[PDB]
């Protein structure tokens, strides 16, 4: 007979047919999936008196355990079974309630924001309820649904209750972001943005995904703080961090201005770096997992040698700061010294007036001042061989993979900002954000400036042709610009940067997949002109959308500080060596757009930045950012078992992909980053990768590390993030 304990707390006969129907419902349209196999593997685990909910858990997991290269469709079977499970949990049935009835109920529960009820009328919810297509839930992969259930769907974190489904999440996000639009257009915007995100054309970041529609206003996920050379600024920086990490933001800290140990603050940088680290970890589980930062300083800082070894697990406690990452800042001259085999002079930034400023803003001024202070020997200095310093850096980069590079001249010669008024002097955690900052006197200093950026991405595998990006860019810029006015700012200098510059960072996902379906590869140069064509479309249409927005709602207060304002464009300033590795002409009318930008300006000072996506891109089953996949199948752990994901369309494209370790070297990849960088406002999270077995005695030579570094420089790469080393 076999008995089942129902959802309330009573028993009944086991319904073997109802289970079979749900399985058959889930398998519809799927290939290479045995419903019979899942049935055998889950039926054997049942027992007299089993809770109904555990039957669902058992069938889901049974389907999930079969995910593979030979039968990737188990991704979708398992998913739909979970959606089915999640529906019952949330509503007590498969069919979601009517939108209004749901919104009402949730506001009363304090889980949705009450402004929704004010901003929209019942009739307007009836109309939004018709935009929705709940069957789009049938289109998630298993991993995607695990992410929704883990961290996106409005849920009770205490009792483990799920309150909504993915389409309510999407419509309501659309609603809050366009709430302030006029009735004339309000709802048509709402429909179009819902469509774009529910069909995975636009990818949304985690804080937006889990928060917008809820009573929270915390959406800033990355902040950039410059720290001046005084205790007041140090404390101010430290307080800002604590405030931001308590809201889960990732931090980018510039601390290169702090004077060296032994100067006229006797104790130097390291004790303060330690303090910033404890600042970052001040809201972490136990001082480990959670809270992250990258800290930036110039290569020529007097104390640089001590700083290069800071996460080297091989020292004494007093001269180590292991749990932050570091970004070393370099320019043309630093490299020339390496090439010429000469020396590099180390100064404390406090003994060389005007030297730090020029480093970022003016390369020839840096030239004169640098050589000057090298002749002038009343000035405190250390002389080091350029090969040794570069070697040390790369040696620490190689072993930790967590010493980064920033080319500060590229960040300013090829930038949407006038380095004279607003230079770029640092980046964020992952190295894609590149915005102006100003140090603070005090946590509440009005004259300080902390940079903020609001992110999103286009899915290159969900767009059929590049002209779709027009409608999508309008939708993405307008949505994210509305968020700027919606979200809280816990530190006044942060509100300054966001309202003054209105900076955005819209990037890409599914790039590997996109290259695959166009029959191109990373490593051989075959993708060069396609990347040029693809990334020109992206930037032209983002610039266009922000331009229409400036015409509708006025340019950004601090617009006059951009190179855009002076009629300059990315196509005018890019590293000129890109000409030698691609010949794709420009397809869009850049000259008309120049004029239209001259006249009416841009709503946002920056629009584009290529971030790593990781949690995000799972939602739409996509390759991460612009990275090649490590394998065909991605494995993850969870409380619920092994979570597997198959790269999209493996069936037809397995040989079309170029997996990470199939690349003979880094050159091909770096050429594409350079080509992308021609159009990108900010920067790109770009990695270098090395497989020991491709080398004699399994040792990666320094010569190749320095070579790939110089390559990235040659093609106008702004930043270099992770170094990944394969292991046997």
């Amino acid at each position: 007979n076999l008995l089942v304990t129902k959802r309330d707390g009573s028993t009944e006969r086991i319904n073997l047919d109802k289970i079979h129907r749900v399985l058959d419902w889930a398998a519809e349209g799927l290939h290479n999936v045995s419903i019979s196999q899942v049935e055998l593997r889950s039926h054997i685990q049942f027992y007299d008196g089993i809770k109904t909910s555990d039957i669902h858990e058992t069938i889901i997991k049974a389907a999930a355990d079969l995910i593979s290269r030979d039968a990737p469709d188990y991704q979708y079977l398992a998913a739909r079974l979970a959606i089915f499970h999640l529906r019952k949990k949330a509503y007590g049935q498969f069919e979601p309630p009517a939108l209004y009835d749901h919104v009402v109920k949730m506001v009363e529960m304090g889980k949705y924001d009450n402004h929704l009820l004010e901003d929209y009328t019942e009739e307007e919810f009836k109309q939004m309820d018709t935009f929705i297509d709940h069957d789009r839930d049938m289109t998630f992969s298993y991993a995607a649904v695990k992410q929704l259930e883990g961290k996106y769907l409005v849920q009770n974190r205490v009792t483990g209750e799920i309150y909504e489904s993915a389409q309510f999440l999407y419509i309501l996000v659309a609603a809050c972001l366009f709430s302030n639009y006029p009735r004339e257009t309000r709802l048509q915007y709402v429909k179009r943005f819902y469509d774009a995100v529910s069909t995975f054309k636009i990818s949304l970041p985690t804080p937006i995904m889990s928060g917008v529609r809820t009573p929270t206003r915390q959406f800033s996920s990355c902040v950039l703080i410059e720290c001046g050379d005084s205790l007041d600024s140090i404390n101010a920086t430290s307080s800002a961090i604590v405030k931001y990490v308590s809201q889960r933001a990732g931090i980018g800290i510039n601390a290169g201005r702090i004077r060296a140990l032994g100067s006229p603050f006797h104790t130097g940088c390291i004790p303060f770096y330690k303090h910033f680290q404890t600042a970052v970890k001040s809201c972490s589980q136990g001082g480990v997992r959670g809270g992250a930062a990258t800290l930036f300083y110039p290569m020529w800082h007097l104390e640089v040698e001590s700083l290069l070894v800071l996460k080297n697990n091989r020292g004494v406690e007093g001269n180590r700061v292991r749990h932050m990452d570091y970004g070393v800042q370099i320019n043309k001259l630093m490299y020339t010294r390496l090439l010429k085999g000469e020396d590099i002079t180390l100064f404390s930034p406090s003994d060389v007036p005007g030297l730090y400023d020029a480093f970022f803003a003016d390369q020839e001024e840096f030239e004169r001042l640098y050589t000057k202070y090298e002749k002038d020997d009343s000035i405190r200095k250390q002389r080091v061989k350029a090969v040794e310093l570069f070697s040390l850096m790369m040696q620490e980069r190689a072993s930790t993979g967590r010493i980064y590079i920033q080319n500060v001249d590229h960040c300013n010669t090829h930038s949407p900002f006038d380095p004279a008024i607003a230079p770029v002097r640092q980046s964020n955690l992952s190295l894609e954000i590149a915005l102006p900052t100003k140090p603070l006197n005090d946590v509440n200093d009005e004259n300080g400036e902390i940079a903020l950026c609001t992110l999103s991405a286009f899915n290159l595998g969900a767009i059929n042709n590049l002209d779709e990006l027009e409608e999508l860019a309008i939708l993405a810029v307008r949505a994210l610009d509305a968020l700027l006015d919606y979200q809280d700012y816990p530190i006044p200098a942060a509100k300054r940067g966001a309202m003054g510059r209105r900076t955005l960072g819209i990037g890409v996902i599914n790039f590997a997949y996109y290259l695959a379906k166009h029959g191109k590869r990373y490593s051989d140069g075959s993708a060069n002109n396609l990347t040029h064509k693809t990334f020109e479309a992206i930037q032209y249409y983002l610039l266009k959308a922000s331009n229409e927005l400036a015409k509708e709602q006025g340019a950004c207060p601090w617009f006059n500080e951009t190179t855009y304002a002076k009629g300059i464009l990315p196509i005018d300033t890019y590293k000129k060596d890109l000409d030698t590795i691609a010949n794709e002409p420009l397809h869009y009318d850049w000259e008309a757009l120049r004029e239209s930008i001259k006249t009416h300006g841009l709503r946002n000072s920056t629009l584009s930045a290529l971030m790593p996506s990781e949690t995000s891109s799972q939602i739409s089953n996509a390759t991460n950012g612009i990275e090649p996949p490590r394998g065909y199948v991605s494995i993850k752990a969870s409380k619920d078992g092994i979570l597997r994901q198959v790269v999209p369309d493996y069936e037809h494209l397995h040989d079309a992909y170029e997996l990470l370790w199939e690349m003979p070297g880094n050159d091909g990849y770096l050429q594409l980053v350079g080509i992308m960088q021609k159009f990108i406002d900010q920067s790109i999270s770009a990695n270098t990768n090395y497989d020991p077995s491709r080398f004699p005695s399994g040792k990666v030579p320094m010569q190749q590390l320095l070579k790939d570094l110089l390559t990235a420089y040659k093609f106008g790469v702004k930043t270099l993030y992770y170094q990944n080393t394969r292991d046997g």
Binding site: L339, K340, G341, Q395, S697, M702, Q703, L705, L710
Partner: peptide
């Protein structure tokens, strides 16, 4: 682990 193969002549050619 990495090898400190640094050849200054090899490098010096590169144009930035």
């Amino acid at each position: 682990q990495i090898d400190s193969e640094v050849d200054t002549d090899d490098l010096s050619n590169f144009q930035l």
